[PDB]
Design a binder for this molecule. Sequence first.
Ligand SMILES: CCc1sc2ncnc(N[C@H](Cc3ccccc3)C(=O)O)c2c1-c1cccc2[nH]ccc12
Length: 151
Amino acid sequence: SEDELYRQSLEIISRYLREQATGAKDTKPMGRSGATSRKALETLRRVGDGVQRNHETAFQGMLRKLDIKNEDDVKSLSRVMIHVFSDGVTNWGRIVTLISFGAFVAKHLKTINQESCIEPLAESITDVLVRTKRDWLVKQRGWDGFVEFFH
Ligand SMILES: CCc1sc2ncnc(N[C@H](Cc3ccccc3)C(=O)O)c2c1-c1cccc2[nH]ccc12
């Protein structure tokens, strides 16, 4: 507790992954910094859906290489994301791609009756993002900078 960037990041990524997987939109209000979290999630529905639709073939190719089947295969994805995501350049384009790929995997997890793995997947993405890019996210004004960037 007393890490608002982490709390706000978890809220936005977890809601996106669950909405993408199930189709149900959460009507429950956002916590502290509501305006920003709603806009961020609206941005993700536009830009995130756009990445998955536009690059379906590349996403399907990667999903098949990673061969996700169960909780163990999801736990394994964290190491891949550190290597693929964290060890590349940092920009909102790559951040949206990571979260979009999470949504792509979450839809995959729903289709194989592995919904229980969607929350850990969301936790793992948020940890990779916030733990490895903390100072960059702060410099870029966090989720307010994300919304302004993709306006
Ligand atoms: C673990 C899956 C991840 S996390 C991740 N985090 C950031 N960026 C990524 N991709 C962009 C390249 C890119 C752009 C649009 C569509 C598809 C790919 C980048 O690296 O700049 C990926 C990937 C990823 C997913 C699917 C195929 C992939 N090919 C190489 C990475 C990658």
